[PDB]
Amino acid sequence: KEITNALETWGALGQDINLDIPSFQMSDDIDDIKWEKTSDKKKIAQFRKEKETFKEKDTYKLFKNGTLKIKHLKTDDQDIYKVSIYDTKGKNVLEKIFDLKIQER
Ligand X SMILES: *[C@@H]1O[C@H](CO)[C@@H](O[C@@H]2O[C@H](CO)[C@@H](O[C@@H]3O[C@H](CO[C@H]4O[C@H](CO[C@H]5O[C@H](CO)[C@@H](O)[C@H](O)[C@@H]5O[C@H]5O[C@H](CO)[C@@H](O)[C@H](O)[C@@H]5O)[C@@H](O)[C@H](O[C@H]5O[C@H](CO)[C@@H](O)[C@H](O)[C@@H]5O)[C@@H]4O)[C@@H](O)[C@H](O[C@H]4O[C@H](CO)[C@@H](O)[C@H](O)[C@@H]4O[C@H]4O[C@H](CO)[C@@H](O)[C@H](O)[C@@H]4O)[C@@H]3O)[C@H](O)[C@H]2NC(C)=O)[C@H](O)[C@H]1NC(C)=O
How many CA atoms within 13 Å lie on the side-chain side of 88? 6
What residues have CB less than 8 Å from 88, skipping those under 6 apart? 29, 30, 31
x/- binding map, residues 40-59, to ligand X, per CB under 6 A?
Answer: --------------------
x/- binding map, residues 1-40, to ligand X, per CB under 6 A?
Answer: ---------------x---x-x------------------
Contact 98, 9 (CB under 8 A): yes
By the rule CB under 6 A, 75 interacts with ligand X: no
- Residue 20 Cβ vs ligand X, minimum distance, rounded to whole Å: 4
Q: 28, 3, 6: which is closest to 101 by C-alpha?
A: 6
By the rule CB under 6 A, 63 interacts with ligand X: yes
27 vs 55: CA distance, rounded Å: 21
x/- binding map, residues 82-101, to ligand X, per CB under 6 A?
Answer: --------------------
